[PDB]
Amino acid sequence: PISPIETVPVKLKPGMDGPKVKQWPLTEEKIKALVEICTEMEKEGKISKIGPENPYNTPVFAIKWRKLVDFRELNKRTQDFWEVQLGIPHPAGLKKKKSVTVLDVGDAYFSVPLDEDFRKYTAFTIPSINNETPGIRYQYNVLPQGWKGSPAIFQSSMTKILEPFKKQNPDIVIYQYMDDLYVGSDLEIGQHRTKIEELRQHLLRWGLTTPDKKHQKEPPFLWMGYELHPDKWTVQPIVLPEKDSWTVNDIQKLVGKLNWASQIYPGIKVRQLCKLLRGTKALTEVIPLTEEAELELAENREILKEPVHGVYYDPSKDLIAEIQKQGQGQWTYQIYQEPFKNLKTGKYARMRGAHTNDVKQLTEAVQKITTESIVIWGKTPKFKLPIQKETWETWWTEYWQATWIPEWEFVNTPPLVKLWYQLEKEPIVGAETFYVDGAANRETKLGKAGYVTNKGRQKVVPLTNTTNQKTELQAIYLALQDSGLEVNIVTDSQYALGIIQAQPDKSESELVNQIIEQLIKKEKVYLAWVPAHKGIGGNEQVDKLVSAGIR
Amino acid sequence: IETVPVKLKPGMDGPKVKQWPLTEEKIKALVEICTEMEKEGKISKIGPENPYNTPVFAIKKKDSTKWRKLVDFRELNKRTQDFWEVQLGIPHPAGLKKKKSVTVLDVGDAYFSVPLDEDFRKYTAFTIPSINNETPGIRYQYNVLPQGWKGSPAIFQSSMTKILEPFKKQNPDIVIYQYMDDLYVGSDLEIGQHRTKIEELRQHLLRWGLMGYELHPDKWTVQPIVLPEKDSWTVNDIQKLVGKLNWASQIYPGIKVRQLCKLTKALTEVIPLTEEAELELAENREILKEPVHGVYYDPSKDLIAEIQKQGQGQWTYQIYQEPFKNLKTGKYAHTNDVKQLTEAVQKITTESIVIWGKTPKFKLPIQKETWETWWTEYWQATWIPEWEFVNTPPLVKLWYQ
Numbered sequence: 008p009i010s011p012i013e014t015v016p017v018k019l020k021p022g023m024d025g026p027k028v029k030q031w032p033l034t035e036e037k038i039k040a041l042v043e044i045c046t047e048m049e050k051e052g053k054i055s056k057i058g059p060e061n062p063y064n065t066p067v068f069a070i071k072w073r074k075l076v077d078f079r080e081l082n083k084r085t086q087d088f089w090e091v092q093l094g095i096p097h098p099a100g101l102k103k104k105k106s107v108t109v110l111d112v113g114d115a116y117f118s119v120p121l122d123e124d125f126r127k128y129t130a131f132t133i134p135s136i137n138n139e140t141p142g143i144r145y146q147y148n149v150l151p152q153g154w155k156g157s158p159a160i161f162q163s164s165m166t167k168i169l170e171p172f173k174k175q176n177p178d179i180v181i182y183q184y185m186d187d188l189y190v191g192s193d194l195e196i197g198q199h200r201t202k203i204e205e206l207r208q209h210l211l212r213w214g215l216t217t218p219d220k221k222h223q224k225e226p227p228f229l230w231m232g233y234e235l236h237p238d239k240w241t242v243q244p245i246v247l248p249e250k251d252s253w254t255v256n257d258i259q260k261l262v263g264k265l266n267w268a269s270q271i272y273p274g275i276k277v278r279q280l281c282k283l284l285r286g287t288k289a290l291t292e293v294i295p296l297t298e299e300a301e302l303e304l305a306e307n308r309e310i311l312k313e314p315v316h317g318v319y320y321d322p323s324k325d326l327i328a329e330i331q332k333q334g335q336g337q338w339t340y341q342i343y344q345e346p347f348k349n350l351k352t353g354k355y356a357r358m359r360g361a362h363t364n365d366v367k368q369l370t371e372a373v374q375k376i377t378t379e380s381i382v383i384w385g386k387t388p389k390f391k392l393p394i395q396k397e398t399w400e401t402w403w404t405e406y407w408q409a410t411w412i413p414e415w416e417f418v419n420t421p422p423l424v425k426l427w428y429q430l431e432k433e434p435i436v437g438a439e440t441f442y443v444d445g446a447a448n449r450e451t452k453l454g455k456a457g458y459v460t461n462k463g464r465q466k467v468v469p470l471t472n473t474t475n476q477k478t479e480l481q482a483i484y485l486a487l488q489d490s491g492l493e494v495n496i497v498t499d500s501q502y503a504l505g506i507i508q509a510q511p512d513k514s515e516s517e518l519v520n521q522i523i524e525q526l527i528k529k530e531k532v533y534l535a536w537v538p539a540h541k542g543i544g545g546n547e548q549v550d551k552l553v554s555a556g557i558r
Numbered sequence: 559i560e561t562v563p564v565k566l567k568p569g570m571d572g573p574k575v576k577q578w579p580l581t582e583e584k585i586k587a588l589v590e591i592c593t594e595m596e597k598e599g600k601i602s603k604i605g606p607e608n609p610y611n612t613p614v615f616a617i618k619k620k621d622s623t624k625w626r627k628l629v630d631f632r633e634l635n636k637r638t639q640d641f642w643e644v645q646l647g648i649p650h651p652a653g654l655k656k657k658k659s660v661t662v663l664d665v666g667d668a669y670f671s672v673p674l675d676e677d678f679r680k681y682t683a684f685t686i687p688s689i690n691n692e693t694p695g696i697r698y699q700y701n702v703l704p705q706g707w708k709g710s711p712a713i714f715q716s717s718m719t720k721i722l723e724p725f726k727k728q729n730p731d732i733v734i735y736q737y738m739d740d741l742y743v744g745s746d747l748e749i750g751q752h753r754t755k756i757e758e759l760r761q762h763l764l765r766w767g768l769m770g771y772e773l774h775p776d777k778w779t780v781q782p783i784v785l786p787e788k789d790s791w792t793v794n795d796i797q798k799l800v801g802k803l804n805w806a807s808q809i810y811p812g813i814k815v816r817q818l819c820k821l822t823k824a825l826t827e828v829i830p831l832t833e834e835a836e837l838e839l840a841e842n843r844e845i846l847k848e849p850v851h852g853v854y855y856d857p858s859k860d861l862i863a864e865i866q867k868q869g870q871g872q873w874t875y876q877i878y879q880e881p882f883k884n885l886k887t888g889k890y891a892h893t894n895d896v897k898q899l900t901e902a903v904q905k906i907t908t909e910s911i912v913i914w915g916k917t918p919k920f921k922l923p924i925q926k927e928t929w930e931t932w933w934t935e936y937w938q939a940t941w942i943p944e945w946e947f948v949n950t951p952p953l954v955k956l957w958y959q
């Protein structure tokens with residue numbers, strides 16, 4: 008039908024006029040196919056015949072028989088509407104329901120009126136055998152199939168229609184997603200079917216037809232990759248193929264599927280499968296699976312061995328979010344309300360820092376979950392974390408960055424998190440003092456890194472291809488090698504200081520990793536900074552001999 | 559009745575900013591606030607033919623029990639400037655900042671009176687979100703001057719002046735400044751006297767639609783970079799000492815670091831103070847507590863503010879337009895890093911407003927995500943400053959202790 012709902016005022020963009028692209032003659036049968044389809048729609052009210060007034064026309068054509076109307080120009084020329092693409096509810100946020108049923112709207116778009124003042128711009132022509140004969144002029148009376156604004160005005164139309172019913176039935180839940188309506192409630196099979204008939208009828212009062220009980224449709228539901236039961240949810244069924252040869256495209260899809268599963272499957276890892284990708288290559292290139300990868304796929308297959316389902320949200324309970332350190336830079340979490348009935352799983356390996364440690368990673372993960380928890384449940388979860396509340400304050404307080412974790416508490420699930428070394432807050436007595444320094448010729452890209460000591464010692468190991476910066480980490484590194492269990496170091500590089508002063512426990516930097524490894528071996532390390540190019544007995548000294556030649 | 563034809567900038571287009579995900583309780587709060595507002599016709603439902611959007615938050619009155627809706631017109635403001643600034647700009651009185659006491663009155667409740675130019679209402683579109691996106695989400699637009707929009711005060715001046723006129727004439731020494739939803743009124747009167755004059759003012763406003771903030775700008779002093787007094791310096795002590803002396807060097811023309819310098823060496827080793835030593839810092843001390851030489855406010859170049867976390871509820875901050883030529887630098891001290899930083903910002907912003915009549919853009923030493931999550935949870939002010947996230951250069955934090 009065509010809904011008696013009021014129309015949405017539409018407009019073209021400020022400095023533009025309707026579309027006027029000429030019609031490109033079609034084949035005999037396509038002509039025939041169109042004339043048929045157009046007469047049918049015409050009787051239904053979907054379209055109308057217009058006088059040679061409308062200077063507007065947009066190309067039309069047919070494909071095997073249905074009618075496709077290209078609206079590129081009308082589109083580009085139309086306007087912008089309130090985004091329809093905003094956010095997809097997550098199943099884990101859903102309240103449990105007793106009866107669930109799904110109704111789809113037939114010819115949704117064609118069921119909804121188009122602003123009268125705008126109908127003229129949709130005018131299109133049915134070509135004669137070639138040209139050489141006027142041609143049947145048509146304009147739309149309802150939301151055309153590929154025109155922007157349809158997805159939006161429809162959703163608007165549907166809402167305002169659904170309004171009253173919702174008002175008269177607050178306990179009932181209705182979710183609109185495209186041609187579909189999902190309807191849930193806490194009623195028993197009979198009495199819910201009644202309420203749905205009360206809905207279908209209501210919906211028909213407004214021009215929307217739906218399938219009858221006969222050809223309805225029952226749970227589970229397959230929505231956006233999920234499988235939705237009224238009492239539980241999971242991700243859509245998924246089979247990891249058994250193969251000898253894996254193409255990049257094969258492993259691509261695999262990594263994708265795994266990630267999607269980790270939404271509810273705990274323990275999923277893809278690190279070893281992602282490495283296999285690192286590096287430019289064609290999607291047809293076969294890649295032999297490294298040993299870790301071969302095993303990763305093993306377990307992954309194991310935790311997927313048996314179906315697993317997430318529970319739905321009970322508003323009257325707290326959310327318990329739990330986090331575990333699995334491997335390096337890898338973090339997994341679970342969210343439940345009753346010890347171990349998960350609502351959703353998840354993993355986290357994102358760490359945009361060039362250099363970083365566990366306590367920051369852990370806090371970052373917590374932040375992600377926090378925000379993820381906000382949109383899903385609208386409240387914040389209680390956290391259980393593998394970090395001593397003391398080994399967190401220490402960090403919290405000394406760090407230069409502002410933090411804040413929601414209510415959390417220690418949970419003892421190794422590996423636990425901790426600082427793998429602490430820098431001294433004051434100098435060390437009877438500790439060799441190392442004035443380190445770096446240098447490098449901008450042209451030539453070569454340089455030298457060394458140090459001098461209050462005990463007379465001196466070194467100057469030369470390096471090959473490195474930046475002015477690297478001749479600074481290399482030196483502070485040097486000082487670490489030849490020094491005792493307990494030494495203080497002076498630099499003029501706020502760079503190195505910065506990197507080292509934030510207690511990194513890992514880095515995407517060969518050198519930094521070694522320094523860390525060394526930092527962990529010591530017992531007391533104190534690092535200090537002086538301004539370069541002053542008269543500092545030491546820095547100047549190491550500068551003299553580090554900058555002698557090649558600088 | 560008479561609506562002021564608001565016209566967006568030439569070329570620029572309406573705001574299209576996503577609504578930040580809100581907690582259940584703020585939503586409930588907002589749905590109530592908004593049902594009331596449209597009931598009283600201040601806002602209207604709107605169709606999908608309106609593509610614009612501005613984020614909206616819920617804040618609690620003045621740390622009380624009553625919720626207040628807060629719109630983020632940052633973006634709309636940036637695209638309306640010419641109008642609110644060059645068009646109907648409000649002049650900033652230098653006198654304000656010298657007064658003994660400044661009170662801050664929220665007078666935004668007055669804009670709802672004046673109607674908004676129908677042709678401009680569409681850009682004030684905003685959205686109330688829903689949990690897990692289970693319901694589409696309620697879209698409104700304003701039919702009347704909205705609170706957080708620099709366009710309002712600009713448009714409301716004719717009325718505000720009319721209103722304040724009588725009071726101003728009877729109190730020609732009292733200074734009154736308007737800045738987004740707030741009145742800043744300051745006098746050199748004694749506390750009680752001042753407070754009476756505020757009430758006496760409050761009754762004037764009351765006739766056009768309803769001790770706010772006790773502020774003493776004349777008592778605001780510079781946080782001088784401080785040099786230790788010690789008693790027996792070590793290589794380390796003196797080393798760090800010239801460290802910041804060098805930093806200050808880059809500001810405060812005249813700072814001298816040498817003498818100290820000439821003074822290989824062990825780190826723990828103590829060292830005697832040189833006759834040429836005292837001479838130095840002594841004089842470096844003299845300067846530093848004095849105001850910068852050569853630095854001045856440039857009314858056309860907006861203010862940038864940094865804040866470092868000195869730990870222990872301590873926070874240092876500077877305000878400047880060109881890095882290191884700073885107009886001002888101070889300090890600030892269930893409390894958490896984010897709670898305190900949110901206060902530090904409001905504090906810094908308020909002073910800024912009193913002094914220059916504009917907010918600074920903040921370099922917040924936090925994680926965007928973290929800040930965006932929590933900032934609203936402690937925020938109270940009716941305006942929002944431009945911010946930005948960064949990493950406190952280790953040494954900086956120290957040179958401002």
Ligand SMILES: O=C1c2ccccc2C(=O)N1CCOC(=S)Nc1ccc(Cl)cc1
Nearest residue numbers: 101102104107180182189191235236237692
């Ligand atoms: O938001 C939705 C979505 C999203 C995707 C699919 C179905 C539904 C739905 O019914 N709603 C309305 C709320 O449904 C609620 S609260 N609970 C449900 C809904 C649907 C099902 Cl199958 C189980 C549990």
